[PDB]
Amino acid sequence: REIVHIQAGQCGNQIGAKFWEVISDEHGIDPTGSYHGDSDLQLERINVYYNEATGNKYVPRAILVDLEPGTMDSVRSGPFGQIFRPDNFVFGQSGAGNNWAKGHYTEGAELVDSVLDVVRKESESCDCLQGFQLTHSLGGGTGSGMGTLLISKIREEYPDRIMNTFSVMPSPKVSDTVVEPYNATLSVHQLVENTDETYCIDNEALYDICFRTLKLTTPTYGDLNHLVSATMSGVTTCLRFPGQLNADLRKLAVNMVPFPRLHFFMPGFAPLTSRQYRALTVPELTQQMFDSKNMMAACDPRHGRYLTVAAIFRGRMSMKEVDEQMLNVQNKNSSYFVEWIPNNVKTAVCDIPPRGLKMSATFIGNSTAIQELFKRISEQFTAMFRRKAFLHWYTGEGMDEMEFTEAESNMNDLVSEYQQYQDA
Amino acid sequence: MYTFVVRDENSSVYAEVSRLLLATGQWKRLRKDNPRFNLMLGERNRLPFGRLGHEPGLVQLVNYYRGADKLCRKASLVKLIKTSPELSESCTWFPESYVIYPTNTDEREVFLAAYNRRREGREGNVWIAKSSEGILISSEASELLDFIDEQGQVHVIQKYLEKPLLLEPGHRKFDIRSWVLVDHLYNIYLYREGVLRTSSEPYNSANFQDKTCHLTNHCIQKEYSKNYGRYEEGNEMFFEEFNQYLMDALNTTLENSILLQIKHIIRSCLMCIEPAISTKHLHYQSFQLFGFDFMVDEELKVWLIEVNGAPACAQKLYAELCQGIVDVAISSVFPLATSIFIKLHH
Amino acid sequence: MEVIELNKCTSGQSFEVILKPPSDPSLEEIQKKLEAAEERRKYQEAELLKHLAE
Amino acid sequence: MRECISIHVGQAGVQIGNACWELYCLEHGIQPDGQMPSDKTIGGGDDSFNTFFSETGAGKHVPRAVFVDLEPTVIDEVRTGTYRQLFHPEQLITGKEDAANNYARGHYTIGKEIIDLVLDRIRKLADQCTGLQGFLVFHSFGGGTGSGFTSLLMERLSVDYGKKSKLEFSIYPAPQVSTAVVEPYNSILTTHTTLEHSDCAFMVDNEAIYDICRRNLDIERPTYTNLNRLISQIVSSITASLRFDGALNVDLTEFQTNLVPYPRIHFPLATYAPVISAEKAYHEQLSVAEITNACFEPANQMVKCDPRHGKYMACCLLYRGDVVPKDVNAAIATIKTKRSIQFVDWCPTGFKVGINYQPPTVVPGGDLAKVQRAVCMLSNTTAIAEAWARLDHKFDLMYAKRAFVHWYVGEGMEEGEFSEAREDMAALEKDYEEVGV
Ligand SMILES: Nc1nc2c(ncn2[C@@H]2O[C@H](COP(=O)(O)OP(=O)(O)OP(=O)(O)O)[C@@H](O)[C@H]2O)c(=O)[nH]1
Ligand SMILES: Nc1nc2c(ncn2[C@@H]2O[C@H](COP(=O)(O)OP(=O)(O)O)[C@@H](O)[C@H]2O)c(=O)[nH]1
Ligand SMILES: COc1ccc(N(C)c2nc(Cl)nc3cccnc23)cc1
Ligand SMILES: [Ca+2]
Ligand SMILES: [Cl-]
Ligand SMILES: [Mg+2]
Ligand SMILES: [Mg+2]
């Protein structure tokens, strides 16, 4: 039933805040936590994400984590800032310097116990906690290094819950430092072992979407996060809205992940929106959500095969038309769906549309083309690592080159494992 | 755009159908095991009918009629003709036949009761034996059953046709292949073109151990026959030449002396089994191409011998016939963006 | 085709129509299976926790 | 009079049980509170309807039913629904978290912790029974609870009630309404483990019910509600002989006796007619001959398959409404001439016939029109093996890659249970083929 949400680092907290704004709006809750919507679909499952507090108040079940206070302060001062319980703000002062080792081994270790204290308090107030979701980037230090520290600590203390992450992948087109491939590779190694399901949110894909199709010449992090929050509302709709399919994080893992390690999902969204007036037809929605241009991980789906797919349609529309169009996509492109998982495409419908859209579609694919993502990272890793460039930032925190070799090998193994099933 | 799947690579007719379908740009072929097909060109053995028609959003069609084997394997067809009121043991266009099982219900104890009346009545008592290579045409039974039991599968033995119609010049035998296409609506379509598979060796009514002037198989004639092809290229006389012959030599048409009987026999057989195999109200649909093998006697009486459920065509007619299958069996169900078949109905 | 065993009453009748004549483990073993699976589960959990202790 | 206890397991079992018990109440004139006026014997009786309802001193008729689900959301709707007063709280059993579509999670992990509670509640029902004859068990093949907990419960019922009969109503999985990609796995696993504990099993393929709803009820996108009201009609047609006066299929033993000569082949095919839309303005009412004949169209079967290319081992015709024997025999005579109906050589070619003069009750506001006569045919034909073929193929496609197996092994199941189950199914398919070709 209940989900415990954790946002770590600058990126993790900025996209986390946007997510809570968006779904708080969808469920009728206002910045003070007071429900003010009209329908009752909005409250049936409101407890999957919110706690109820004195005076009919709704408090997100969310822990905010950072090693520097800047972005946390920015959240408290932001739109929905005061809807979170102040005791769930857990921060240090020294930052992590975009350094995985500082997040995972030195600065982060110093802070991680008190985060786990807040996690414990939130979970013992749960009737049947189903698991955790973490928002973070992989390119910085706190989100990647200390978020993966958190994940393996949470797994140690709660080995029977689901661990789900929204993980933002670095891209040179949207790059803070040159060490992002290092941080990303180290984190992927962690994720491949300690999450059940990871949404790969590629800052490359987000940039290309803002640039090539939303016609934004100078994309900001805000333009990127508008896409991310649309996708996040989309992929959690079947978790937080009563539908025919009464979904949870474990059923999603069971049905989407045919082999433990291949749990890295390509998300997609349609229609692609910028921060319009023409209503989309269900055939259009369906063609767009499957379009490479609507996917948030910069991969060509035609370069691999779909293991599984989950698809969510939001709005009032023809269930019959949806079925027909989904079947048409599969029957007209069956080449790209593995034939050894029968009926590997499942669809769900929710009547409630997202804000500002009469209809939308969200896509969750487990495709072997995700290997392209990891190949990208791996190339950027090796280019530096073969000259041991920038390693001193990491050896100075106690890390050894051997650990870089191990994470690189494990990521390359992940790539080979995807390639194994692209050809079965 | 339509999808098909090919599960019998060793079929000449459906190889040509695959090519014709691709050449339309509106059909793409999938891997043999991909279940999201509109069309299945099935394997000849143990075709999985039970898996057809359970794919939502796909109208599914297959090139075989489940159950049509009762017509198309020799013991089955004899049992069907004898036991079915529509055809009856009094059937006038099927030779006397009996189902015999090897040494290792049967019908040899009912056979002998008739064979000895044939031998006493001093009638021609030649009988032929075969199953579904290993043929024996003999004059006395103890050769027949003796041979049957050296093999080990069920056999049928039936009254050999002692007075066939012989083509001159040459004094030779022949069989008539008719091709018939039953579509998913159970329209019965007879192809305009038949073929006469002839023998190249005048008919020697003496010793029935020489199978070269008594069996008309295109195979046994190319290899073991003296002058394979002296009278017609490949030992195959088509319908125009044969009608011409019937007019010149015998003063009749092919249509009147023979084809009327052939259309009657075809329609009778297929209408008889229609309730057992029709896909009219089924979750998947069937069509099928049949080869009816006919033998004409010296009185211009037609006889049915085998129905083959997976026949090949004559190289001359592949193109036209396969294009007809596409037109009436496949595009009728899956449309694209002066007919060569005669429709049998009465 | 003959009609037999006709039985009838105010809510309805029943009868037969012939057209042609004719031509476990114990509670012990179960709780053992359940507990064997629990043991495999506990072992996998201990493997995981040891790896995390490393 | 001998009692029958109904057991509904998982979402599919519980929502179908709701449908059936609503229907039952309407048919026997039992009000939503549990009061049946026509019941002059207050506080007890050995009437026919008493095999499914017990009575309280206050004249409340209470289903001999247990609802069990591993999460609470579906049974909570029973607890707050129209028929809340009907059921006594101890009968509605719920867990905290479901089986996650995972047979092994329902059988081993979560099953082991609630099995004894369920058996205790079932015993409290059985202790109110003078002569219990056994159990009717509703469940999906595809759900994790439906498959995994159901098989555990069946094993334990064979232990604690060895001489009692056990009947299944089982929802076979269909992609158009399915909720999980691993439903073939769960189906094979629960069938293998349950085969020897079930005396007779009625399979409903959601594909067939879905298409019946679309073609004959003109429902464009059927819901679980549409499907379940149609299924509950079929189920009521099957159990009417246990709830009413008659001489056919009066106890559970008679189901096996009349429908299952070989004990492993215990999956009778159900065919039902007529299904007529309530929105049909002008309907011409169908004769005995028309509805009986419709019992041989695959489009009316609970499982799409072709009985022409199989053999029959038994055949029962259950009519409801204005039907008399001679019109039945007249319809059979003609049908026999126009249809391919082959019995196995060691069985008589014949039909056991049951007529109940009360025509089908229909749910007010539902999708089904009232009709003057209806029939349900129960025939044990080898053709139903087609469905096993389909399932065993889907299974084989995933298992050849071991896709998803790790989710089952991680619950304590051994990989070998997969191939064991699949081997049992291969045996079943061969039994069918040798009995029928
Ligand atoms: N006919 C019908 N089928 C249903 C219904 N509910 C679920 N199903 C089918 O049952 C299968 C899913 O299993 P469920 O019964 O819902 O799952 P469960 O038994 O509750 O087990 P869990 O995995 O723990 O949730 C799918 O094939 C569904 O389409 C229903 O109300 N009617
Ligand atoms: N999409 C997105 N990416 C971000 C955002 N903020 C930072 N990033 C990316 O995250 C990486 C830097 O990590 P960051 O979160 O800033 O460091 P941290 O505070 O140590 O966890 C780089 O790849 C940045 O492009 C954001 O708001 N949105
Ligand atoms: C391809 O096979 C499946 C079968 C089920 C599922 N489930 C559990 C889902 N779970 C959640 Cl949270 N959202 C969804 C949104 C759309 C469709 N399905 C789901 C996913 C894939
Ligand atoms: Ca009473
Ligand atoms: Cl007992
Ligand atoms: Mg930063
Ligand atoms: Mg459930």
CSV table of N, CA and C in Angstrom, one decimal, chain C residues 5-6 9 11 13-14 23 25 27 32-33 36 38 41 45-46 50 52-54:
chain,number,residue,atom,x,y,z
C,5,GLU,N,-35.9,-43.5,-17.1
C,5,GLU,CA,-35.7,-42.9,-15.8
C,5,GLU,C,-36.4,-41.6,-15.6
C,6,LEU,N,-37.5,-41.4,-16.3
C,6,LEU,CA,-38.3,-40.1,-16.2
C,6,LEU,C,-38.8,-39.9,-14.8
C,9,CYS,N,-41.9,-33.8,-11.0
C,9,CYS,CA,-42.2,-33.1,-9.8
C,9,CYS,C,-42.7,-31.7,-10.2
C,11,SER,N,-41.6,-28.7,-9.6
C,11,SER,CA,-40.7,-27.7,-10.2
C,11,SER,C,-40.1,-28.1,-11.5
C,13,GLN,N,-39.0,-31.7,-14.4
C,13,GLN,CA,-38.7,-33.1,-14.6
C,13,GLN,C,-37.3,-33.4,-15.1
C,14,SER,N,-36.8,-34.6,-14.9
C,14,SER,CA,-35.6,-35.0,-15.5
C,14,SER,C,-35.8,-36.4,-16.1
C,23,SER,N,-20.5,-48.8,-28.1
C,23,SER,CA,-19.7,-49.6,-29.1
C,23,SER,C,-18.3,-50.1,-28.6
C,25,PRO,N,-1.2,-36.2,-0.5
C,25,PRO,CA,-0.3,-36.2,0.6
C,25,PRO,C,-0.9,-35.7,1.9
C,27,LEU,N,-1.1,-34.0,5.9
C,27,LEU,CA,-0.8,-32.8,6.6
C,27,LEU,C,0.7,-32.6,6.9
C,32,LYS,N,5.7,-29.8,5.7
C,32,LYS,CA,7.2,-30.0,5.3
C,32,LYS,C,7.5,-29.2,4.1
C,33,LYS,N,6.7,-29.3,3.0
C,33,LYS,CA,6.9,-28.5,1.8
C,33,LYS,C,6.9,-27.0,2.1
C,36,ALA,N,10.1,-26.1,3.9
C,36,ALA,CA,11.3,-26.1,3.1
C,36,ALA,C,11.4,-24.9,2.2
C,38,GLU,N,10.1,-21.9,3.0
C,38,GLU,CA,10.6,-20.9,4.0
C,38,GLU,C,12.1,-20.9,4.2
C,41,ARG,N,14.0,-19.4,1.4
C,41,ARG,CA,13.8,-18.0,1.5
C,41,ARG,C,14.7,-17.3,2.5
C,45,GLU,N,17.9,-14.7,2.0
C,45,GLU,CA,17.9,-13.5,2.7
C,45,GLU,C,19.3,-13.3,3.5
C,46,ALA,N,19.8,-14.4,4.1
C,46,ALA,CA,21.0,-14.4,4.8
C,46,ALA,C,22.2,-14.2,3.8
C,50,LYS,N,24.6,-11.0,4.2
C,50,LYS,CA,26.0,-11.1,4.4
C,50,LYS,C,26.8,-10.3,3.3
C,52,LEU,N,25.7,-7.6,2.0
C,52,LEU,CA,25.6,-6.2,2.4
C,52,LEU,C,26.5,-5.9,3.6
C,53,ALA,N,26.8,-6.9,4.4
C,53,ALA,CA,27.8,-6.7,5.5
C,53,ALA,C,29.2,-6.5,5.0
C,54,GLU,N,29.5,-7.3,3.9
C,54,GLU,CA,30.8,-7.1,3.2
C,54,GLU,C,30.9,-5.7,2.7
